[PDB]
Symmetry: D2
Subunit: 480 residues, 4 copies
Amino acid sequence: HHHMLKDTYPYYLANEAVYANTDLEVTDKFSGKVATRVALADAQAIDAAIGAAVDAVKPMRELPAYRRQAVLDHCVARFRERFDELAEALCIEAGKPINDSRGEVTRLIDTFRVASEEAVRIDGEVLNLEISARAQGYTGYTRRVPIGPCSFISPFNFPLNLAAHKVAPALAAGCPFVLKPASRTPVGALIIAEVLAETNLPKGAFSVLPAHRDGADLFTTDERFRLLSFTGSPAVGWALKEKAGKKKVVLELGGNAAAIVDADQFEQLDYVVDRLAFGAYYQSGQSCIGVQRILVHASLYDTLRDKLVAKTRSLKMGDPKDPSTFVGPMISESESRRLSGWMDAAVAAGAKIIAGGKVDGAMFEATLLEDVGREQDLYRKEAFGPVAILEKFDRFDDALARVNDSDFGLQAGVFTDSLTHAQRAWDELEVGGVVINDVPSFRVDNMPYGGVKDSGLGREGIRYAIEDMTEPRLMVVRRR
Amino acid sequence: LKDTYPYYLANEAVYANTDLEVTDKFSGKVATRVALADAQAIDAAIGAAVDAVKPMRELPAYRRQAVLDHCVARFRERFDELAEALCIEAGKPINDSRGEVTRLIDTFRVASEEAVRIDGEVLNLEISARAQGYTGYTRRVPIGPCSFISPFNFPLNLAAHKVAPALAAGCPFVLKPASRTPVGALIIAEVLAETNLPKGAFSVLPAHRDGADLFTTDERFRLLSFTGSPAVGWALKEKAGKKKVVLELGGNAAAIVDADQFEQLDYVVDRLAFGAYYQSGQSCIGVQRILVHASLYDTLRDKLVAKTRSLKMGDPKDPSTFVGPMISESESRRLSGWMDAAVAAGAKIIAGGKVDGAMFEATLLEDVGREQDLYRKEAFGPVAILEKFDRFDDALARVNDSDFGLQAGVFTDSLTHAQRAWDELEVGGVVINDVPSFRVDNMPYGGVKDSGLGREGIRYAIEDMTEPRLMVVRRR
Amino acid sequence: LKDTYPYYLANEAVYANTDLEVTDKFSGKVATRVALADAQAIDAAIGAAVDAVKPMRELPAYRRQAVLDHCVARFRERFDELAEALCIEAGKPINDSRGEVTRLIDTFRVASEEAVRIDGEVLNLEISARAQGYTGYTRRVPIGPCSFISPFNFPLNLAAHKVAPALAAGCPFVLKPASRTPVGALIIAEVLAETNLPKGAFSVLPAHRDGADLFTTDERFRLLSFTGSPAVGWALKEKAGKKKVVLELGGNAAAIVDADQFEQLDYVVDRLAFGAYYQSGQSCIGVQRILVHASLYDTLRDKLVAKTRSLKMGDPKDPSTFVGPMISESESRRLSGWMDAAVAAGAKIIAGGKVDGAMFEATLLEDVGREQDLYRKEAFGPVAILEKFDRFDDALARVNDSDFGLQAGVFTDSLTHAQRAWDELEVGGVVINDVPSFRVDNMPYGGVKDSGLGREGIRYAIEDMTEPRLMVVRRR
Amino acid sequence: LKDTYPYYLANEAVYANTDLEVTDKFSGKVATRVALADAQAIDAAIGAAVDAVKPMRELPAYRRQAVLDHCVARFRERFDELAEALCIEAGKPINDSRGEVTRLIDTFRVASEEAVRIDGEVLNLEISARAQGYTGYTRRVPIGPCSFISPFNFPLNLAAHKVAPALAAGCPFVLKPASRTPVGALIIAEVLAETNLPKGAFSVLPAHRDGADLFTTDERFRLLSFTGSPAVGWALKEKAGKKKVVLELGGNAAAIVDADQFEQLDYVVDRLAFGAYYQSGQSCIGVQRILVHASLYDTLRDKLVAKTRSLKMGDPKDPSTFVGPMISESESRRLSGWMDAAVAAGAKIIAGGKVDGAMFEATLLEDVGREQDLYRKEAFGPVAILEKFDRFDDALARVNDSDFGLQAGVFTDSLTHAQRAWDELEVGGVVINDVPSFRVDNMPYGGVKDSGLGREGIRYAIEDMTEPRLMVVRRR
Ligand SMILES: NC(=O)C1=CN([C@@H]2O[C@H](COP(=O)(O)OP(=O)(O)OC[C@H]3O[C@@H](n4cnc5c(N)ncnc54)[C@H](OP(=O)(O)O)[C@@H]3O)[C@@H](O)[C@H]2O)C=CC1
Ligand SMILES: NC(=O)C1=CN([C@@H]2O[C@H](COP(=O)(O)OP(=O)(O)OC[C@H]3O[C@@H](n4cnc5c(N)ncnc54)[C@H](OP(=O)(O)O)[C@@H]3O)[C@@H](O)[C@H]2O)C=CC1
Ligand SMILES: [Mg+2]
């Protein structure tokens, strides 16, 4: 350990640091103390950033692929150099257990490395257009042109890697961008910005501007932005789509992800239980694909329940700086009170707490319930905390229907060795991604990732983000 | 035309009323009457589309293909009927109407081919030790019920660019054609009704814009795909709610004639006259602005004035007619007013200029200021403007001097200039050695800036009408 | 059958002689006589193919498609003629002959679709400062004249897998069908002669192997694509010279029945009988070896013995015949000799076993030693061997215990076992939940080890029948 | 250079002997001595490769990438050592030796990128009712042990174009470098020996052609990939047996200068001189023939004569040297004999023309008859021929007037002419606005006609070093 968190941070306006004020206090989410103060961007700074992004469109578009790759490679190298600094910043400002903070910094590097690879292979097509006599002598050629200035909004819980899934493809694609990180967790994004400020990018290629939601209207409504890409809560995301105007909108939202445990899993129950506990309680359940609902075949239910109760009770809660901590604080006392209120309501309606259940401020222990009615808020809304619900099924198709019994559809997991059941799940689960033999909580950063129903609109993963951040431009050549 | 047409509700002909009168756009007389859908019928169609989602999703690729092949065969069989219906209800010259029916067949044939090759990917996910043992598999799943809205000017082929990919992708859909030209869509519906598609796979429902709110707002639709005016399309995007939105809109397309074109001027002029005046300029990629290098401007002008004056205006049923009626006297009046204002501000009519009701002759102007409505707004009529340039980059800048960006054309033999145009023209498509008005129905097609959001062409519409669904398999 | 057939030399029928007698493979009587091409005719065909290279290359994609579509339509109209000819000259049961004609049509249909989507790539080449300003563009150019050799058992469809992609790719070709079954190829040629292909686009020339050296050695062919026995194919590769060589050969295909299959044994047994005995085992992916988990062996054995005994042997013109004659008495003698040797070494015939001329009953043995010719060589007749395993990995190793590697089948519901089989089976294709005998005509298809070199299936044949041609453009 | 180098047998350095002397190609003195592999060592290497097939196949993609990344990092650290070794053993001017080390790194970097994206396809197989319920999944499986042979002139980068894709694809390989230039390959081997690759993943074995039969004939190799002279490559294809063969050979590359190039002549002349005389013309895409439009022939000739005469010849250790020694006096004598014959038949030397041992001046000739050896065979030395044309199609015909077809270059700004050249030049690659001598290491690269069979460039080499393995899954 060597402490590198600064007492103050600037924001980044058109690639350069501005120590405009110290008005945004960032707390340590475990101690509650102010850990650092960062510059808060007002609407004039946001407007200036957008104008600079417009001016950077042509210089960014003209940057050759290998230069964009070199920028991304510089980031990769510097993130590796500053690995412990990034991990500690994440631990402090998100209250994220240090082991898992280190894991997210590894993902940040992974995401930029995928972007570095994809930056030099944004290919096009030579299209046969001679499909009829009228088109004799015509040929098509395609390319992907950067869409223009992009507006990026990211959430508190994976602040490094979810910013990376917008920033890194934008650089690969050649788009200027303005990123607004979560005000509770801005420091990681500002370290990313400091690293980018070391590169030769054209001025206006990027701004990173902390701003509260109530001062952030221009990120959605300014017509100079050609894309809004938002990662955050469904309630916010769908509201911003309505206000976005002409720009393209990409939404990465939330859900109440389910895992199914099939009848053939007896011999690997310890593996299953370990992955269920990871998915339900990693980062205290503050994951957009955290396991919230667990559907277990009746033949295995009692044995799995005993094992999962024991595993859940074994998880260490406490200071996220402690490398033995698995369950750190929830992001605020108000979020803990929201979830504990839903838990109380489920219990009042007949549910039973079978592991955990103690809440002390933002310290919510890993908690497991059964007999939760499907009508309950704890069942149907996004828990976003260290609570999971255990339920029983007989017929695989009933398990699938109950996974789908939701407003949401981000990912689902199925522990099965049956080809028939895996195929049926792929056919029938209305989700962005179906995970076989692991929890829905799995993501690798090159894969297409996103939700359907109320959980999203579009996909991230570097290739898919590049597609959204570019416009195809066809050239038709006529030969006579 | 038949005396009356039904609408199609969940694959079924319903003779609900005869309330929508469709006029012959040349004679002005009522040519047919068709059933007008009310909100109850639209709601029932949407509910039926929801119930058809699973049966459509389960329809095998080769059966979706067979449905598309049946349409192709019947459109060939009914070619003259379709072309004459187009001629009547759109006032479209019969030669151009036949051209559109040929394209209707082309569009469905591309869809037939694409229906059986909606492939996915086996993705390497082992990019780090954490992901050892994981593999990805992808497929495209139908997005769900689709809402389709189409315009008056290509009533068969632009409906086809939504209907045919929806069938290939496995989506139920509800199509609202233009009230001025609904018969083509209703003949497409009649042919689809012959097939064994599951009930609720399709509805085709005439409705006026003021009775069509549910096509935009109903949350059971997962996609709205709109083809029509920019003013309407951007307004509907604001009201669509959660659904995906695809927009195919309009523009003021330009053609550049480079300094190396002197020996090809007769070809260039023929294509300019085609692009500016085909279907009386009622094309979303009609040539509206012509930028010509100063070195050959005067020769091109003489030839283009002569060509424009040679174009025959009159009854669209006459095969010799090139310029038929505009869609209404009010649209002709709108364009004539813009022309008058440009002349009042200093422009000069150098060919044509006579307007009589909806009969607007092929017209060419010079000295149109770039601030004029005739320059900047979508003319959608048989008027083109001619202007001069010296430097190629100035021509490119002036093409881009617009709210719009659908397609642009560049007549050049210079690799350097073609490459520069591809780099710099902010449009969906750049056409080299033909006008921007060229489209072949498999190509990616659409606009940027105020001209659109997304692409049509069968492959690209299938992408919008499906959701990727990843399956990650972990081996331990 | 007509009394005589011509051969086709540079698109035209030539009734050169009646020197090749084609027998009815069930009655033994001469059914027709066809013209036999000598080396002078083969040489002339090659020269004509060279002269047709440029006109074939300049044929637009939609014209190549139209040629293929004409074949599809005419094969449909001549369906019964084609099936009856195949039934007579191959002794193929009429139901399976009709099934092959359907495949012939489907193979040409896939080629028709692919003919208009032979796309290329726009490649980013700016991977370093040295390559700043360079871009790559690719296309596929026809490779040139192609030499095609096809076998007796699927004479229509295996010719189609060379002819149809050649037409889609723009290659002139010269096809030598099997002398035992040349008529189907000559009907295909007659249909092609109705199209307006440039003269020299195709020749179809019956010739015996000992008069066929030019098909391998002539340097004017740029590709030899051979479907036939491994002994011949590997020997032709050695003699081919500079040309590209594609080989589609044979094997001793295996099916594994996993421990989880008890509830679907009737399905498994039905597919095993189909794969082992369809066309009397005269299939390059016929089931020859059946490995069954010990826990299910006795139940499957009883069901498979009963199923095998139920198969009707006899006249292939009878639609109830499943087991028709083998292609000749000499081939029946070959297989009967291997069967006798296996029994002498301890094997047991548990169903069938009677041989009378070319009429070889559907036959099942157990206790066949892995050293036996019946185990290790290509049976190509209505014999299958049944063996037992305990460990899934042992089953996989025993599938691989072979010179060959075309396809293998695994009946399993285990993801773990399906994945392991995909990892470990050294074959071109692994079929899960069906026999190795399955093929659909768009899929990549071929062998590794001694079973082949390269892949057919339309897309993959087009790749072999074309050369990529890169255009690098430098901007500075 | 070190005093001695070992060879690498199954990943390990073996100082077996010092029997292969490597000379400094400028001084002629022995610069180092390396271990020469005999048949026993080659056979041991092949057996070890066979044993490494399964461990190499099971290496996860990210581990193969890490191996490649280790190579990139160490090549950067050892950049000067690699460049000096190449300068000495090939006589390659130090500036250009440094350039080839940069290419070595670039080639491994492309391979590192491609190693983690060897994706497959999820194929729709439901193209007919018979195939209802079937789906296809593909993967690329390493082909097995690969035999690699590389030439003297780009010994680092051409070894890299085999070694790096083999590692990305998961194939064990045995590489035989050119005996005249083995040190660079042995440094690559030393770096690979630092990685944790399974034993038998690689061997690098110097051996003379007369002791190298097993590299072509041993049946345990599944692929021979040969880069070298056409006379050798086509001969090895005849002897290869069943294995797949890939050939990267030579040619007599041409550059066309079109009529529109007057304002660019200094750029054109600089690139022509570079392409003709880089590494003293010892390049498989060196410019040998220069076709110039009559309208600017005299001006180009004057400029190219002056540029050619300005090139500095001498010690390749001097950074100012561009024309170093040819690889041997025997090769110099070969080319000077062809030059003498051309002059005796009427050609004129207009620049250079003098030869002193292996020091052959940059030399330009006119009036070389198309029949001459200097015109038609591969010069592989610092000689270029200048000729005149009036019609672009005639220039294209004359480029094609050759046994060869690797790459051609065309300096033109005409879209029409660039398209015609892409249509008509029978070469692997057409370069627009640069010489045929351009290559970037990700692009598809290779020859047609006598110049090659197949393509290198990382993606394309991976395709040849893998077999597709289809998994068909049936759902009922
Ligand atoms: N990008 C493309 O592919 C093309 C685009 N176009 C564009 O189409 C326009 C010309 O067509 P036009 O028919 O006049 O266009 P409109 O925008 O006037 O109408 C198009 C369609 O939208 C419907 N519509 C209009 N307002 C609403 C509303 N509030 N809610 C629901 N539906 C509504 C119309 O209904 P109704 O008329 O029945 O009331 C009609 O079906 C031009 O701008 C042209 O560029 C044309 C061809 C090609
Ligand atoms: N991979 C695949 O797609 C398939 C492969 N096969 C394989 O085909 C074989 C059965 O067919 P079959 O006809 O008996 O095979 P053969 O190898 O006996 O004959 C195949 C073709 O090759 C010709 N031929 C044989 N020797 C030569 C030669 N020296 N030069 C030129 N041509 C020659 C034959 O001519 P002719 O007979 O006229 O003398 C015939 O046209 C089996 O091994 C089977 O596995 C079958 C079907 C599918
Ligand atoms: Mg600290």
